[PDB]
Amino acid sequence: SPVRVGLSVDASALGHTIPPDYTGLSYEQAQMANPNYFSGANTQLAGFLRTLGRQGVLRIGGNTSEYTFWNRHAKPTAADEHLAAGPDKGHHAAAREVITPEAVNNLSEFLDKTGWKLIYGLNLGKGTPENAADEAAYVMETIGADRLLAFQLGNEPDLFYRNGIRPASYDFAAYAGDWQRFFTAIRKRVPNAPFAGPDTAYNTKWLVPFADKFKHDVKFISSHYYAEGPPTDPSMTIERLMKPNPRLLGETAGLKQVEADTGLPFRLTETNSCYQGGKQGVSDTFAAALWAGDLMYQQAAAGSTGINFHGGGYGWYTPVAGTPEDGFIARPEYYGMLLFAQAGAGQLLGAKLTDNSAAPLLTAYALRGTDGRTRIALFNKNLDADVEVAISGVASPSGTVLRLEAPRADDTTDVTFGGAPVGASGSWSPLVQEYVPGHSGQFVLHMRKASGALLEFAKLAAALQH
Ligand SMILES: O=C(O)[C@H]1O[C@@H](O)[C@H](O)[C@@H](O)[C@@H]1O
Numbered sequence: 001s002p003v004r005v006g007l008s009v010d011a012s013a014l015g016h017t018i019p020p021d022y023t024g025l026s027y028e029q030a031q032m033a034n035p036n037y038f039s040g041a042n043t044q045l046a047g048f049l050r051t052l053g054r055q056g057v058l059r060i061g062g063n064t065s066e067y068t069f070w071n072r073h074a075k076p077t078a079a080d081e082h083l084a085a086g087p088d089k090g091h092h093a094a095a096r097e098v099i100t101p102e103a104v105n106n107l108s109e110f111l112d113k114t115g116w117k118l119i120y121g122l123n124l125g126k127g128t129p130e131n132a133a134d135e136a137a138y139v140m141e142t143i144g145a146d147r148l149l150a151f152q153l154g155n156e157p158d159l160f161y162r163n164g165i166r167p168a169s170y171d172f173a174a175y176a177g178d179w180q181r182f183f184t185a186i187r188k189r190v191p192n193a194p195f196a197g198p199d200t201a202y203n204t205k206w207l208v209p210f211a212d213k214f215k216h217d218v219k220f221i222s223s224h225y226y227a228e229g230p231p232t233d234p235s236m237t238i239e240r241l242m243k244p245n246p247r248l249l250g251e252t253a254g255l256k257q258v259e260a261d262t263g264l265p266f267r268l269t270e271t272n273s274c275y276q277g278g279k280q281g282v283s284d285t286f287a288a289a290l291w292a293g294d295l296m297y298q299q300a301a302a303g304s305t306g307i308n309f310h311g312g313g314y315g316w317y318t319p320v321a322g323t324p325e326d327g328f329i330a331r332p333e334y335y336g337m338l339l340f341a342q343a344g345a346g347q348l349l350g351a352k353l354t355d356n357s358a359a360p361l362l363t364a365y366a367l368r369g370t371d372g373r374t375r376i377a378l379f380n381k382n383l384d385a386d387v388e389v390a391i392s393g394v395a396s397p398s399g400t401v402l403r404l405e406a407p408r409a410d411d412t413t414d415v416t417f418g419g420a421p422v423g424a425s426g427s428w429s430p431l432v433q434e435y436v437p438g439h440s441g442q443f444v445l446h447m448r449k450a451s452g453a454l455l456e457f458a459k460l461a462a463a464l465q466h
Contacts, residue, residue: 002388002446003359006352009366009376009393009441013350018300018367020345021117023337024057025049025319026270026308027085029121029155030064032107033097034083036324040109044328047425048320049114052334052341058111059119059269059308061155061199063088066125066165067096070135074100084323086313089277093164099135104142117149119196119269119308122186124154124178125165129185136186136193150196150219152269153182158203172206176213183217196220199269202247204254211262220305221258222269225251227291228282229275231316236279238287238409242361242381252302265305271295272309273333278316286332286406286415288317290452293336293404294379297365301348309337330422332406332415338428339404339417339454343367343375351376359385362447366394369456376455380447383409391443396457399436399443404452 031037037045038058049056064085071078078098088094111118120139122132136151157175160166166174179197186193198210200223211221225248228236255266273283273291282288296307311318319337322328330338344367351366361381369375374394380387402418415421419432436443436455447453459465 002386003356004388004390005356005359005362006354007364007389007391008352008354009374009391010350011368011374011393015348015350016300016303017347018345019305020053020055021057022300022306022345023053023296023340024059024306024308026059026061026310027312028062028064028088029060029068030085030094030097031083031312032060032068032099032103033080033085035079035100035103035106036081037084038110039106040113042110042324043113044322044425045320046110046113047427048328048330049116049426051422051426051428052337054115056116057119057149057306057308058114058116061119061121061152061270062310063090063155064094064097065121065155066123067094068099068123069096069127070099070131070138072101072134072138074098076100076102079103082325084313086315087277087310087317090275101138104138108142111143111147117147118143119150119152120148121152121155122182124157124182125160129182132182133185133189136190140190140193145192148194150194151186152196152199152222153179155199156201156224157198158200158206172209176210179214194219196222196267196269198222200224204250207254207258208261211258211264215262215264218264220265220267222267223251223254224270225268226271226275227273228279231274231276231279236274236282238282238285239383241273241282241287241291242383255304256302259303266303267306268299268304269308270310271307272311272317274317280316281410283317284331284412285410287409287450288333289336289404289415290379290381290450291336292333293339293377293452294363294381296337296340297377298363301365309333327424332412334422335404335415335417336452338422339377339452342402343369343377343454345370359387362387373459374457378445378447378453380449380451383450386449387447389445389447391445393441394438394443394457395441396438396460398438399455399457400433401436401445402430402433402454404454409450
């Protein structure tokens, strides 16, 4: 029989605001070698982005951002017209790649079709300062100041000391040396160039020092998060993914500290379920939908201003898989992001769970949407326990629920949201939407084990609204 838990919504306890550009994706800079991928002609991928959000952020970086070289004088045919660059697997140096001017032109078209903004990585790892300044000039001219959110100078510089990009003695001070040189060169050529950093892999000790040292130079602070890895490790499983861990706790403490101590916004600019390119039977499963949806809300509740889920090609953890030649499809993780998309922007509200020690992995977030309607996103990440949730503090004549479901937590397919799969080019409409009648602010919702739900509550006395 279900675990009976209480959910107390407190509309008077206002939390952080979820901005319209909260959602986002991350891709390898190596993708810029193929101008057909981020292109106005890539209507399928653009549709998947628009379904994820009217607004949102595309971040380009990753390990390959150290191995990609802008060449303003490249033959256009230097482009690899067939490349679908999956997440870097981090085992060794990536292939070097050239970025052509047409790739940047096509990226602008893609941003225009999607309505998304851009975070753009620059090659501080293996590139020169002059070439970074040239690259930044072209991107600023082509993408424009309205859509260019930030440049980032190097990806995960806290790992340079061990992956061969720098000597083993590389540390924060040395990175701050590197960063200052690149910054200055770029600003000389592009006086309005926006920046973010440090784009760190894990090392939260770099965050406040970076923010303090470069406070007047950056728009926001960024760091990364991967829940699990390596993939070959038998301890890295679906159940573990449903649980908090010390890394997440430190990253969360980390973002709170930098926001409190500096007043700069934080963005989680690269995240996914398992590093080294993800884990088959974990990252590509319905479990990842619950993981990602919940992470979006948990991060927002802690103060994050956005997220970028890493992906590309047919990578085990990619939200969207495919190529311009064969077409694109939503993987399971996409459906967690879709639940968030459907919930929309607004302001988080107090929502406390009780009597939940036998269902400890259930999470719930309450939101007053921009339109004034209360929503509740719930993730029953308990793999073995169904729950019955007694919801109080929501006064509405009624709510509807859209379910996030698959027949088993490890399914690589059969994933639906609101009773429907996502179709071609991001097409999605709910086909199953159940009612919940309520009284005195009280509602009772059952959820199967390993499932999600989005509740949307009706306005009071709004039946005859225009
Ligand atoms: O290992 C991974 O999956 C990812 O690790 C991150 O640290 C890198 O920035 C990215 O390029 C990789 O794809």
